[PDB]
Amino acid sequence: GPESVLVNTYQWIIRNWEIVKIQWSQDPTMLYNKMEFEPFQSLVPKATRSRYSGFVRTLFQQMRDVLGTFDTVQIIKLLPFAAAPPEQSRMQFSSLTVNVRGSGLRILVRGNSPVFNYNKATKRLTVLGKDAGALTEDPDEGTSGVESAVLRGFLILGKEDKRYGPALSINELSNLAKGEKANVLIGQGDVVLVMKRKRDS
């Protein structure tokens, strides 16, 4: 069933992470088009599939372009959304819908959610209340706290910094100049400092 499709997709990515990481790094196009992501894509609503994919593919390229910000879990989380033919847009998506429990459940782009829950204490991924397997320590993992694959055209720099003013919503960022910093209401009471990048991916 649909719940098992999600679990099995993420399980598959983890089991095959050595080759998936390599392709993600050097031939993402042939990774994104793998048939193994088609069942997951069937669960992504037809109307938003392509925009989700353009968004995610752009976020992944930010990660490649902004050196030393590799985030293993973020790649695994978002990867299956990259499989649809991409469509461009200006929008920020804070969450991505999958059709599972008879209905839309949303995976949060930043951090854990009920659908996608990575446990840093146990090093295991849980997807819809099911184990999707263990992650191994990767020396390439970014340790600086800069998040390059959450917002399209922005880096999350770290904690709220009151100097840069009161928080903007995700939908209020489009007037920021290249290189300008602001506080942003990223989710769940969390305010983070962000920077609009000068060059887009």
Numbering used by the authors: 541 to 741
What does the paper say about this structure?
Viral determinants of virulence and transmissibility are still poorly understood, although lysine at position 627 of the polymerase subunit PB2 (PB2-627K) is now known to be important for avian influenza virus adaptation to mammals. Here, we report that a basic amino acid at position 591 of PB2 can compensate for the lack of PB2-627K and allows efficient replication of highly pathogenic H5N1 and pandemic H1N1 viruses in mammalian species. Our data indicated that a basic amino acid at PB2-591 can compensate for PB2-627K in mammalian adaptation; interestingly, these two residues are positioned near each other on the surface of PB2.
To address this critical question, we present here the high-resolution crystal structure of the C-terminal domain of PB2 from a 2009 H1N1 pandemic virus (A/Mexico/InDRE4487/2009); the PB2 proteins of A/Mexico/InDRE4487/2009 and Cal04 are identical in the region crystallized; i.e., amino acid residues 538–741. The PB2 protein of the pandemic H1N1 virus shows an altered polar surface when compared to the avian H5N1 PB2-627K protein. In particular, the side chains of R591 and S590 in the structure of H1N1 PB2 occupy what would otherwise be the positively charged cleft in the H5N1 PB2. The R591 residue in H1N1 PB2 thus affects both the shape and charges on the surface of the protein, which may affect its interaction with other viral and/or host factors. Our H1N1 structure shows that while the side chain of PB2-590S is in close proximity (<4 Ångstroms) to 627E, the hydroxyl moiety points away from the glutamatic acid and does not participate in hydrogen bonds or polar interactions with the side chains of 591R or 627E. Furthermore, the side chain atoms of PB2-590S also protrude into the positively charged cleft and may provide a steric platform that reduces the conformational flexibility of neighboring residue 627E. These findings suggest that PB2-590S constrains any side chain at position 627. Our X-ray crystal structure of the C-terminal portion of a pandemic H1N1 PB2 protein reveals changes in surface shape and charge created by PB2-591R which may prevent an inhibitory host factor as suggested by Mehle & Doudna from binding to PB2, hence allowing efficient influenza virus replication.
